[PDB]
Amino acid sequence: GAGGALFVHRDTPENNPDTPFDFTPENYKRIEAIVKNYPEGHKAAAVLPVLDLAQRQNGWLPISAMNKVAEILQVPPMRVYEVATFYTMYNRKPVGKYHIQVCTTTPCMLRNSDSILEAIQKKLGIKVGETTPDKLFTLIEVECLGACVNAPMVQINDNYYEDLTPKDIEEIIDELKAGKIPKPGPRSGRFSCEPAGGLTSLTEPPKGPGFGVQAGL
Amino acid sequence: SNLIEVFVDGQSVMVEPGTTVLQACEKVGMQIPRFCYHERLSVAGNCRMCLVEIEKAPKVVAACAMPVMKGWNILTNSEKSKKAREGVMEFLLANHPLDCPICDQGGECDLQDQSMMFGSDRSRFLEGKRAVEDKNIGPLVKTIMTRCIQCTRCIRFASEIAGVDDLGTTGRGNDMQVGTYIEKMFMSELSGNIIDICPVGALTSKPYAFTARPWETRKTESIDVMDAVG
Amino acid sequence: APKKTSFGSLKDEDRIFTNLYGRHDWRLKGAQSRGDWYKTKEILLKGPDWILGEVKTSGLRGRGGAGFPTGLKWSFMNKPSDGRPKYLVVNADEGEPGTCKDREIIRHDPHKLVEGCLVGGRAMGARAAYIYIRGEFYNEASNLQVAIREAYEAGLIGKNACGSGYDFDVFVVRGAGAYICGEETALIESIEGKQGKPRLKPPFPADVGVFGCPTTVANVETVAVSPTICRRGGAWFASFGRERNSGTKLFNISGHVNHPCTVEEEMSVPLKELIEKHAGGVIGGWDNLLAVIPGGSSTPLIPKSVCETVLMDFDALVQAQTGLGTAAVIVMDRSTDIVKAIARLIEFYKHESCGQCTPCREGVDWMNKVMARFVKGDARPAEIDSLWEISKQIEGHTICALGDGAAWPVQGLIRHFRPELEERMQQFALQHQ
Amino acid sequence: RFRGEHALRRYPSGEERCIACKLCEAVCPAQAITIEAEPRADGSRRTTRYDIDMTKCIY
Amino acid sequence: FDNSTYRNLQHHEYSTYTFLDLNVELSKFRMPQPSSGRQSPRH
Numbered sequence: 001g002a003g004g005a006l007f008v009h010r011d012t013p014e015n016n017p018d019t020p021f022d023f024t025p026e027n028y029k030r031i032e033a034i035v036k037n038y039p040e041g042h043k044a045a046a047v048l049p050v051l052d053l054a055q056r057q058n059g060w061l062p063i064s065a066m067n068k069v070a071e072i073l074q075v076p077p078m079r080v081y082e083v084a085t086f087y088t089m090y091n092r093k094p095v096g097k098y099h100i101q102v103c104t105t106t107p108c109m110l111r112n113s114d115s116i117l118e119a120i121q122k123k124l125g126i127k128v129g130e131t132t133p134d135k136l137f138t139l140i141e142v143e144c145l146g147a148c149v150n151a152p153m154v155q156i157n158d159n160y161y162e163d164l165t166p167k168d169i170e171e172i173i174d175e176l177k178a179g180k181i182p183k184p185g186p187r188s189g190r191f192s193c194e195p196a197g198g199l200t201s202l203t204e205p206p207k208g209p210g211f212g213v214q215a216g217l
Numbered sequence: 218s219n220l221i222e223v224f225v226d227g228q229s230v231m232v233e234p235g236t237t238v239l240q241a242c243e244k245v246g247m248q249i250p251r252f253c254y255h256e257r258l259s260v261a262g263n264c265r266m267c268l269v270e271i272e273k274a275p276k277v278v279a280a281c282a283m284p285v286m287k288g289w290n291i292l293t294n295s296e297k298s299k300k301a302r303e304g305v306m307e308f309l310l311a312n313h314p315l316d317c318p319i320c321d322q323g324g325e326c327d328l329q330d331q332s333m334m335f336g337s338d339r340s341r342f343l344e345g346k347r348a349v350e351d352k353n354i355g356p357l358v359k360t361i362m363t364r365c366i367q368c369t370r371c372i373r374f375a376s377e378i379a380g381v382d383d384l385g386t387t388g389r390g391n392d393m394q395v396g397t398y399i400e401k402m403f404m405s406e407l408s409g410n411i412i413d414i415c416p417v418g419a420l421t422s423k424p425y426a427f428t429a430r431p432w433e434t435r436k437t438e439s440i441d442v443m444d445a446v447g
Numbered sequence: 448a449p450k451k452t453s454f455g456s457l458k459d460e461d462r463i464f465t466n467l468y469g470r471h472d473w474r475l476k477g478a479q480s481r482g483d484w485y486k487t488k489e490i491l492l493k494g495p496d497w498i499l500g501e502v503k504t505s506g507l508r509g510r511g512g513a514g515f516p517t518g519l520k521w522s523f524m525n526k527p528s529d530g531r532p533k534y535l536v537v538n539a540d541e542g543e544p545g546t547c548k549d550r551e552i553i554r555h556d557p558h559k560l561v562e563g564c565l566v567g568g569r570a571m572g573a574r575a576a577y578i579y580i581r582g583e584f585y586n587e588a589s590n591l592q593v594a595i596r597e598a599y600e601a602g603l604i605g606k607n608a609c610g611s612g613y614d615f616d617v618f619v620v621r622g623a624g625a626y627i628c629g630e631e632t633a634l635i636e637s638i639e640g641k642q643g644k645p646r647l648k649p650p651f652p653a654d655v656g657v658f659g660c661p662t663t664v665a666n667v668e669t670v671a672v673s674p675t676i677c678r679r680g681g682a683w684f685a686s687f688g689r690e691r692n693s694g695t696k697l698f699n700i701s702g703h704v705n706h707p708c709t710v711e712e713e714m715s716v717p718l719k720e721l722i723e724k725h726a727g728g729v730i731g732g733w734d735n736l737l738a739v740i741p742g743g744s745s746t747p748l749i750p751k752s753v754c755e756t757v758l759m760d761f762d763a764l765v766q767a768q769t770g771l772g773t774a775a776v777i778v779m780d781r782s783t784d785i786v787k788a789i790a791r792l793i794e795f796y797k798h799e800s801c802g803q804c805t806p807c808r809e810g811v812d813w814m815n816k817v818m819a820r821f822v823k824g825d826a827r828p829a830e831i832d833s834l835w836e837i838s839k840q841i842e843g844h845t846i847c848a849l850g851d852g853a854a855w856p857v858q859g860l861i862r863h864f865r866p867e868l869e870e871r872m873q874q875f876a877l878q879h880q
Numbered sequence: 881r882f883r884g885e886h887a888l889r890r891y892p893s894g895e896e897r898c899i900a901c902k903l904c905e906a907v908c909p910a911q912a913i914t915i916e917a918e919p920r921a922d923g924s925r926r927t928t929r930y931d932i933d934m935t936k937c938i939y
Numbered sequence: 940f941d942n943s944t945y946r947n948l949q950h951h952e953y954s955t956y957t958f959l960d961l962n963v964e965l966s967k968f969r970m971p972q973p974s975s976g977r978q979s980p981r982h
C-alpha cells in the first residue's frame with residue numbers, strides 16, 4: 001500500500017526548530033562512547049546510533065532533535081534529514097506508548113496474520129494507521145520482522161510476541177494496558193524455533209571441547 | 218607508454234588506465250546516452266541509461282562508472298545495448314507527466330531527444346502516474362518536481378561545486394523525492410547552474426518562464442562584463 | 448564406500464550449532480563447555496595462509512545466499528597493507544522472508560560468532576570486526592554485546608587476543624529497519640552514517656570498502672562455521688553434501704507445515720525428506736502440496752512435480768530453475784491463493800526498494816500494480832507476456848540484486864501457474880460483463 | 881473536415897485552451913503565426929500575442 | 940543434564956538503554972582507533 005506519511009516537513013507549534021530538545025548528561029556520555037567506536041575523521045558514522053538514542057530518549061524525533069544530532073556530529077542537517085526519512089524505524093511523528101507492529105508478509109500471511117490484525121483492531125477499536133485516544137497504542141503493518149518460523153508474530157517496543165492466536169494477542173494487550181510486562185516469546189508452549197513435534201534434532205548431549213579436533217593443532 | 222588497447226566496435230583505441238567505457242567510446246566520436254553522468258560532477262551510476270554490452274560478457278555494464286579493461290570490445294550498437302536503452306527509457310517515461318506543451322524544457326530536453334533516438338515509439342504502461350508536491354527554493358529556480366527523474370545532478374552540483382549541502386533525497390523507493398525537506402532557499406552565487414545541469418524541466422529559470430522556445434532563439438556568443446572574470 | 452549418493456540424516460555430533468534451540472547456556476561458560484574457544488590461539492598462530500587454505504579445502508560457499516566460494520573471496524584481502532586499516536563486516540541484517548537462522552545463531556550461539564569473527568579477521572588481516580545487525584533484533588544484539596563483553600574480560604579479544612599477540616576488536620552496529628541494508632555495499636553505506644543505497648562494483652570491498660578501507664562482508668553463518676572448520680579441518684566439512692556443495696546448512700521451514708522450525712541438516716538432502724522429517728510434513732498431507740519457495744522470497748517457486756525429487760543445494764536447485772538462496776523453505780498447500788502470495792512478495796519488494804536506480808525504482812512499483820490487478824483478474828492475457836518482458840528489463844540492468852529478487856518470483860509464477868492467471872482473468876471478464 | 885477561417889477556442893468554463901506551447905508557430909509552413917507569452921497574473925501559461933497573417937496563410 | 944529447560948531468559952529484563960550501557964562499558968576495552976589525518980572530509 002501507499003505510504004501514508006509524507007516526506008516534507010512543515011513547521012507546526014508542536015514540531016518546529018524552537019521545540020525544546022537536548023540530551024541528558026548520561027545520554028551525552030553514551031554519545032561519547034558511540035563516537036569513540038569509529039576512526040578519527042569519520043564522525044558521521046555515528047548518525048544512526050545517535051539519532052536512535054535521541055528517539056529512545058524522546059519517544060519520537062522532532063526536527064529539533066535531528067538538528068541537535070547534526071550539530072553534535074558536525075554534519076549538515078540535510079544528511080540527518082536523509083537518514084531520518086530513509087529508515088522506517090525512526091518516528092517523525094509522535095507514537096503511542098506501545099507501538100504494535102504486526103508482520104503481514106507472505107510467510108506470516110500464510111499463518112493467518114489477518115486474524116491477529118482483526119483481533120487487535122476489534123480489541124482497540126482503531127485501524128492500522130491510527131492511535132488510541134488515550135495515546136497508549138499505535139498499530140501499523142511491517143514487513144518480515146525476522147521470525148517467519150514463529151508466524152504469526154507481533155513486535156511491541158523491541159519485544160517479540162509470536163505463535164499468536166487472537167485470544168493470546170488480546171490477553172497481551174490487556175496485560176499491557178494493565179501496566180504489566182508481558183514475557184516476549186512464543187505463546188504455544190514452545191520456547192523457540194524448535195519443532196513442536198518433540199525436538200527431532202539435537203537430542204544427544206553436546207560434545208566436549210577438542211572432540212573432533214584434527215592432529216597438528 | 219602506459220596506454221592500454223581497447224576496441225570500440227572492433228576499432229583499436231589506446232587509452233590511459235582508469236579510462237571509463239564512455240570516455241573510450243567518445244574518443245572514437247560516439248556519445249553514449251546518459252542522464253545522471255556529468256563530466257564535471259562525481260560519478261553516480263543511477264540512471265542506468267548508459268548500459269552497454271561488452272563482447273563475451275553476459276551482463277551489460279554502466280559505461281559511465283566502469284573502467285575499460287585491456288582487450289575489451291565495446292559493442293555500442295548491438296541488440297543488447299539497444300534493448301537495454303529501450304527498457305531504461307520505458308522505466309523513465311512510465312511515471313513522467315504529460316507536460317511537454319507546458320514545460321519550458323520542450324525542444325531542448327535530453328529526455329525528449331534520447332527518447333526519440335534510443336527509446337521505443339509507444340507506451341504499454343496502463344496504470345496511474347505518481348504526482349509529487351513542489352518545493353520553494355527561491356525566486357530564481359522554478360521547481361516542478363513531478364518532472365524529476367531522480368538523476369541527482371543537482372545534489373552533486375550543490376555539494377561539490379557550490380559547496381552547499383542543502384539539497385538531498387528523502388524517502389525511498391518510488392516515493393524518493395529531491396528537495397530540502399524543509400522550506401529553505403537555495404540562494405548561492407552559483408545557484409542558477411542547477412537549471413542548466415538538470416536534464417528535464419523539473420528545474421527551470423523563473424525569470425525566463427514561458428517566454429520563448431529553444432528553436433526560435435538566435436545564439437550570439439559574447440563575453441560577460443558583470444565582473445572581471447570575463 | 449566413498450562418493451556418497453544419498454545425503455541427509457545428519458547425526459548430532461556432526462552438527463555445528465549444537466545450541467540452536469537455546470537449550471543450553473549461551474554465555475561463555477556454556478560455549479566453552481560445548482567446544483568453543485578451544486585452542487583458538489593455536490589456530491591464530493598458524494597464520495592467515497593456513498586458515499585460508501583450510502577454508503578453501505573446506506569448499507565452503509557463502510551462506511548469505513549467493514554461494515560464492517568463501518576461501519577465494521577471503522583470499523582477496525591477503526594483499527600487503529597500503530597504509531589503510533583492514534576491516535571485517537559480519538552481515539546480520541537477515542532480510543529475506545522465511546529466513547530465521549541468523550537470529551538463532553546470534554541469540555543462542557553468540558560466542559561462536561565472536562570466535563569466527565576473530566578467526567576470519569586474523570585470516571584476512573582485519574584490524575577489527577563490525578557486526579551489522581538489524582534494529583528489530585534488540586534482544587539479540589544485547590545478548591551479542593554481553594557475549595562480546597565476556598570475551599573481552601576473558602582476554603579472548605582485544606589487545607593480545609587469546610595470547611596470540613594479534614589485536615582485534617569486535618563492534619556491534621545497529622541499523623534501523625531497512626531490508627536493502629543487508630546488501631554488502633548498502634550495508635557499508637549504512638555503517639558510515641549514510642542512506643542504505645548500494646554502491647556500484649567495481650571497486651569491490653576488498654579494494655574500497657567501509658571508510659574507504661579494504662573490507663570483507665560475510666554472513667553470520669559463514670563466519671560462525673569457520674572456527675569449527677579450522678578445528679576439525681577442511682576435509683571433514685568437505686565430505687558432507689555433493690561435490691562443490693560441501694558442508695552443513697541451516698534450514699528454515701515455514702508456511703503450510705505442521706511443525707515450522709529451524710533445523711540443521713546436510714546440504715544435498717532432498718526437499719521432501721527435509722519437509723517430512725523435521726517440519727512434520729505438509730499440512731493436509733504431501734498430496735496437498737501446491738508449491739514451495741525453496742530459498743526465500745528472491746528465489747522462484749517450484750510446483751509439486753519438482754519438489755518430490757529435488758535436492759537442497761545450489762546446483763540441483765539451479766537445475767530446477769530456482770536457487771538455494773538462504774535455504775528458507777516456504778511451503779504452500781492447495782488451499783493457498785498462489786497469485787496473492789506472490790503479489791504480497793512483490794509488495795514487500797516495492798516497499799523495500801531504496802529507489803536509487805531507475806529499473807528497480809519504477810519497474811518494481813509497475814510490477815506491483817500489475818500483479819495487484821492480476822490478483823483481482825482485471826487484466827488481459829497479453830499482459831502476462833508484458834509483465835514477463837518488464838521483469839526481463841529490470842533483471843540485470845540494476846545496481847544491486849534487489850531487482851533480481853523482485854523479478855524472479857514473477858518469472859516463476861508466470862512459468863508455473865499461467866493457467867491460474869488466465870482462468871482468473873476469464874472469471875473477471877465473465878462476472879463484470 | 882472543411883478548413884475555413886481560424887478561431888481560438890475555450891474550455892467549457894470559459895478558460896482559454898491555448899497554453900502558448902508554440903507548436904502551431906513551429907509547424908506553420910508559411911510562418912503565418914506570431915506568438916509571445918508570459919506568466920499571467922495568476923501564474924498561468926498564456927499568450928500575450930497570437931497573430932495569424934491571413935495573407936501569408938495557406939489554410 | 941537435561942534439555943527440558945529453556946536457558947535464554949536473561950533478555951526478559953532488558954531495558955531501553957541496555958545496548959548503549961553495554962557499549963559504554965565496552966568502550967574501555969577497545970584499541971586506539973585509526974585516524975585519516977583530518978577531522979572530517981570537509982576539513
Ligand SMILES: NC(=O)C1=CN([C@@H]2O[C@H](COP(=O)(O)OP(=O)(O)OC[C@H]3O[C@@H](n4cnc5c(N)ncnc54)[C@H](O)[C@@H]3O)[C@@H](O)[C@H]2O)C=CC1
Pocket residue numbers: 509510511512513514515520540541542543546629631651652664742743745770772773847848852
Ligand atoms: N540472507 C538474507 O537475508 C538475504 C539473502 N539474499 C541473497 O543474496 C544473493 C545476491 O547477493 P549478491 O551479493 O548480489 O551476489 P554476488 O554474487 O554478486 O556476491 C556474493 C559475494 O561474493 C562477492 N563477489 C561476487 N563476485 C565477485 C567478484 N567477481 N570479485 C570479487 N568478489 C565477488 C561479492 O562481493 C559478495 O560478497 C541473492 O541470491 C539472495 O539469495 C538476498 C536478500 C536477503
Ligand SMILES: Cc1cc2nc3c(=O)[nH]c(=O)nc-3n(C[C@H](O)[C@H](O)[C@H](O)COP(=O)(O)O)c2cc1C
Pocket residue numbers: 508509510511512513514515517520538539540541542543626627628629630631664665666667669847848849
Ligand atoms: C537486497 C539484498 C539484501 C541482502 N540482505 C542480506 C542480509 O540481510 N544478510 C546477508 O547475510 N546477506 C544479504 N544479502 C547478500 C549479501 O550480498 C551477502 O550476504 C554478502 O555478499 C556476504 O557474502 P557471503 O554469503 O559469502 O557471506 C543481501 C543481498 C541483497 C541484494
Ligand code: SF4
Pocket residue numbers: 313314315316317318320321322323324326327328329364416417418419
Ligand atoms: S521535462 Fe522534457 S519530457 Fe518532461 S514534460 Fe518537460 S519537455 Fe516533456
Ligand code: SF4
Pocket residue numbers: 364365366367368369370371372395414415416417419420
Ligand atoms: S531536479 Fe533535475 S537534476 Fe535534480 S534529481 Fe531531479 S531531474 Fe535530476
Ligand code: SF4
Pocket residue numbers: 627644645799800801802803804805807808845846847848849850
Ligand atoms: S535495484 Fe532497487 S534497491 Fe538496488 S540499488 Fe537499484 S533502486 Fe536501490
Ligand code: SF4
Pocket residue numbers: 897898899900901902903904905915
Ligand atoms: S501555441 Fe498554438 S499549438 Fe500551442 S496551444 Fe496555443 S494554439 Fe495550440
Ligand code: FES
Pocket residue numbers: 103104105106107108109143144145146147148151153543544545546
Ligand atoms: S514473514 Fe513475518 S517475520 Fe518474516
Ligand code: FES
Pocket residue numbers: 250251252253254261262263264265266267268279280281282
Ligand atoms: S550515465 Fe551511467 S548510469 Fe547514468
Ligand SMILES: [Mg+2]
Pocket residue numbers: 322411412413414415416417418419420421
Ligand atoms: Mg532543466
